[PDB]
C-alpha cells in the first residue's frame, strides 16, 4: 500500500541515497541544488524532458491585476532577466559534473 | 515516444551541448557560425553532404 519503500522527507531520501543502496525521485531543481553544492561532487542526475508545467505566482480569485505580472514575467523571462536572477542559484559553470 | 533527448528551444540545445553530454542536429550553416563565433570557440562540427 506504498508504505514499504517511500519516505517522508528530503533528507530521509538525500542522505539514504548518500549512505545506503537506493535512489530517490524528487524536484531536479532540488535535485541539482544539492549536487551543486555537495562537496564531495558524488551524486550523478537522469532526467526527462518534462513539458506544460512551471512554477507560478497566485492571487485572489479574479483579481484584475491578474494580467500585469504575468506580462512583467514574460518580458524577465524573454530578456533573459530572469534567467540571469536564476543564475544566482543554479549557475551553469558548476565545478561538478553531474 | 521522442521524450528522452529532444529539447524545446535551440538556445536550450546548443547550451546543453557546452555544458551537458549531449551532440545537437541542426542546419550546418548555422552550426558552423556559431562554432566560429562562440567567444571560446569550444564547439565543432561536421555535416553530410
Request: hydrophobic share 35%.
Amino acid at each position: 500500500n506504498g508504505s514499504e519503500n517511500n519516505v517522508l522527507e528530503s533528507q530521509a531520501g538525500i542522505q539514504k541515497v548518500k549512505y545506503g543502496n537506493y535512489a530517490f525521485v524528487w524536484d531536479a531543481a532540488v535535485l541539482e541544488y544539492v549536487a551543486i553544492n555537495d562537496p564531495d561532487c558524488s551524486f550523478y542526475t537522469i532526467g526527462n524532458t518534462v513539458a506544460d508545467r512551471g512554477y507560478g505566482i497566485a492571487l485572489q480569485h479574479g483579481s484584475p491585476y491578474r494580467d500585469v505580472f504575468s506580462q512583467r514575467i514574460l518580458e524577465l523571462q524573454q530578456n533573459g532577466d530572469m534567467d540571469i536572477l536564476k543564475h544566482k542559484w543554479w549557475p551553469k559553470n558548476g565545478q561538478c559534473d553531474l
